Every structure is written in structure tokens, then in C-alpha cells.
Amino acid sequence: FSXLSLCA
């Protein structure tokens, strides 16, 4: 996806 999985 985008900043929803990793962007942590």
C-alpha cells in the first residue's frame, strides 16, 4: 500500500 504499512 502506502504509508499505512511500514511508514510506522
Side-chain angles (χ1 to χ4, degrees), residues 1 3-4 6-8:
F1 294 95
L4 31 162
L6 55 106
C7 262

